[PDB]
Homo-oligomer: A and B are copies of this chain.
Amino acid sequence: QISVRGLAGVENVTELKKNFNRHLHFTLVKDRNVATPRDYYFALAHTVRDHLVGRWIRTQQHYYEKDPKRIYYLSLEFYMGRTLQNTMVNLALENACDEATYQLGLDMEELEEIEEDAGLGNGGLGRLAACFLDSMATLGLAAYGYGIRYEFGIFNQKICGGWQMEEADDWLRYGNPWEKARPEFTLPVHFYGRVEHTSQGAKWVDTQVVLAMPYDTPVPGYRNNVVNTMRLWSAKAPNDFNLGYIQAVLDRNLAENISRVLYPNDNFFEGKELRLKQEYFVVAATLQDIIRRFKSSTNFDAFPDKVAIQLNDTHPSLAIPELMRVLVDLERLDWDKAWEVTVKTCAYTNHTVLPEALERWPVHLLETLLPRHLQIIYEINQRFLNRVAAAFPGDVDRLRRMSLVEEGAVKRINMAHLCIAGSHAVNGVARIHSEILKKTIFKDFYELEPHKFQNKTNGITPRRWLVLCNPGLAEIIAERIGEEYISDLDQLRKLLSYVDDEAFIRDVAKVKQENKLKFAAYLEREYKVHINPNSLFDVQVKRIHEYKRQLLNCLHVITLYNRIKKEPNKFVVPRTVMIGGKAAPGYHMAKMIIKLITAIGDVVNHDPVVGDRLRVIFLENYRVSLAEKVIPAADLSEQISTAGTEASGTGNMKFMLNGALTIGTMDGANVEMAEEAGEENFFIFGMRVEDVDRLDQRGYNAQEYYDRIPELRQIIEQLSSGFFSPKQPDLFKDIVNMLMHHDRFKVFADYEEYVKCQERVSALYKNPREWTRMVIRNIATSGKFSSDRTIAQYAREIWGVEPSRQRLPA
């Protein structure tokens, strides 16, 4: 049907049909009389998987023969989502599979909906890792993603009585056709024990052993026949583990719990032993695998020429002392040489400045679990501080600030300090964030070693986030400028020459309208709710956190409601306000915010005076597959974090690419988006970073805003008095008390500017031609935010490898 989905040749379609029927019979052991839609999904997934394997084998063979520098991307999170459609897109099989399944009496879109998300991440950080793997494959880099194969990913969210309930995400229940277990490359990982000092070096002895079993998942590049590997480790007990008899076997679960479940905190550090075990587990297994591959290419001088290790935040920071341990204790390198190799191999990406998100591990935990690593950390620290003292003689407070070891009631190791000391490059994830790192939390380190500090602004893959989720938009773009933009997103600039083209304006608006209709029907089918698809779709989807300011959005929604009730017969631009996202299970305020959003909905959606002019919907179970549906349907993207808090954001970029306008603060990558599109094509409001600093110096007093803004006072009085919770009048007192007395994120300080800016949004929406022209200017300038651009910069400026768009032979 549409060109960007590829060719459906007679031979190809005939062969797909044959192989589908072969898998249904031989692989699934079903016939057509008893097959369910799930069986049909698996038959198609195996059929498509077969097309990957030849390319996967040949790619890995090619890397063995050419021996390029290898890139290892270490992350505790990979938020992959579904694989079937992405695989078809990257192999140019989508139209062929559509036609094949159509001829078998099946709807391929219905089969796609059966696949579980691989939800092995919390949000942005994990999804960035996934976009990066796609870009690395598309750019022909010899890259490997290494992580943990969690049995349970991010929990499934249910809303009961307006409250979040959590259910385990049993994503492996029906099997995962995309992974290949490799039990033959299983490796041992050590814990506990003690250190003995012999005459020739330290020895780590009396340890408990857990096995790391790898599962490999293919990562196809975009139409280049490159298939890279994501290797995820699963924990297994050895067979003599604890070996009355029955209890010893049952106790194997203690070892296997390491890979059982993803910690569900976004931007928050929980210092639990189990999490530390996960961090070491992934590092120890991965580093053995790296060294094995390096020796099968004595001379570790060449190691940094053949290996780059990228640390996705501090979560895999133990890679630094582990590499030192292996090189010094096992390979018998002198300390100075081992350190040179380590620093040249490792690079660190920081993703947050929030103090509660930074990993600071208690020394007593490390002492018990990883006694040799603690010794190595202390030695790193002493050598590092000796350098500081030589550069800044007499500056004793600098020595305290820069130490890897923090003093206090409980001594802690600051893992960010460890990463900076042990890495040749340290980057933030958007220009403003990288500047904040140099001016504030890592200022001292920047003064010592300015050359280490870089910026790499984040991006998103346009395969998943345009072609896959919004084929209608991809097609109308391709009709004008061809298909090359899918792997060279800067070509979207050519669309600026179509900003006054009446046919293009029409087509852009038509695609948005279709996407809104399709989403409005999805909502009715799966969740029994009636929305007006002519209304402005105002969307805020992301994890629930105080810094992201869903509460500010709530205040605007109540303002609109109160304005309608005051003047019911005045025209207002109709809106559907959709908010979705998961709260971390232990984060009380985030759970209270969810309840507030649903309680506002309960009032607003049932008030007959409001009608269809305002609807408030909480989108349940926000995840990658839901993002693919709602983002193409959005008109307005809410990116309203307090300036200085959102390191980058990536949702922001997904909305820009898909034809929504953005209302946002000058935070993270929003700054760069506005710069690319022009400030006149962005709805910017609120305090800049400098304004927040000025408020913090005099002292934030929320009472001043309450006293001066009557519309704001009315809302607080409604919240306090039980207007949105008549049966439990004090339900929201924690929210009110926080806003009035200990709001770290200054919700009231941006309220007035936010409401005024929202009125400008509504004014523009009344003129559909000018709204759409502004949209075209956004889509046209979104090219910088391709993760292909981001990865090319990492490759050239950090890893020292050249990207390639050349195809391997098929």
Contacts and interface: CB of A to CB of B under 8 A. Distances in A.
A54 interface: yes
A458 to B, nearest CB: 29
B274 A239 contact: no
A180 B29 contact: yes
A249 B38 contact: no
A167 B586 contact: no
A348 to B, nearest CB: 27
B53 A243 contact: no
Contacts of A165: 243
Interface in A240-285: 240-241, 243-246, 248-250, 252-253, 257, 260-261, 263-264, 272, 274
A530 interface: no
A565 interface: no
A33 B175 CA distance: 29
Interface in A36-65: 36, 38, 50, 53-54, 56-57, 61
A161 interface: no
Contacts of A29: 53, 56-57, 180
A183 interface: yes
Q: How large is the interface on A (under 10, 10 to 19, 20 to 34, 35 or more residues)?
A: 35 or more
Nearest to A274: B246
Given A25-B53, A56-B29, A181 B170 contact: no
A95 to B, nearest CB: 23
A152 interface: yes
A571 interface: no
A469 to B, nearest CB: 27
A695 interface: no
Given A168-B252, A260-B249, A57 B31 contact: yes
Contacts of A156: 239
The binding surface of chain A is classed by DSSP as mixed
A527 interface: no
Contacts of A50: 26
A31 B56 CA distance: 11
Interface in A128-181: 152, 155-156, 165-168, 170, 173-175, 180-181
A678 interface: no
B181 A175 contact: yes
Given A53-B26, A54-B25, A168 B249 contact: yes
Contact of A263 (B166, B174, B246): B246
Number of copies: 2
A502 interface: no
Interface in A53-80: 53-54, 56-57, 61
A109 interface: no
A585 B245 contact: yes
Interface string A202-241: 0000000000000000000000000000000000110111
Contacts of A167: 239-240, 243
A30 B181 CA distance: 12
Contacts of A264: 245
Contacts of A246: 261, 263, 272, 274
A57 B239 CA distance: 37
A184 interface: yes
Contacts of A241: 168
Contacts of A30: 57
Contacts of A263: 246
Contact of A250 (B155, B252, B257): B257
B244 A168 contact: no
Contacts of A173: 183, 236
Contacts of A184: 36, 38
A551 B173 CA distance: 50
Interface string A505-528: 000000000000000000000000
A183 B170 CA distance: 12
A45 to B, nearest CB: 13
B585 A152 contact: no
Among A29, A183, A264, the most chain B Cβ lie within 10 Å of the Cβ of A29
A155 B166 CA distance: 38
Contacts of A240: 167-168
Contacts of A170: 239
A53 B24 CA distance: 11
Contacts of A180: 29
Given A56-B29, A184-B38, A239-B156, A166 B245 contact: yes
A253 B251 CA distance: 10
Among A38, A57, A241, A245, the most chain B Cβ lie within 10 Å of the Cβ of A245
Contacts of A174: 183
Nearest to A19: B26
A244 B38 contact: no
Nearest to A169: B239
Contacts of A243: 165-168
B57 A244 contact: no
6 contacts: A29-B180, A31-B57, A165-B243, A168-B237, A244-B585, A246-B263
Ranked 9 nearest A-B pairs via Cβ: A245-B585, A249-B261, A253-B253, A167-B239, A168-B239, A174-B183, A29-B180, A29-B53, A26-B50
Given A25-B53, A245-B264, 9 more contacts: A155-B245, A166-B243, A167-B239, A167-B243, A168-B248, A168-B249, A168-B252, A249-B260, A249-B261
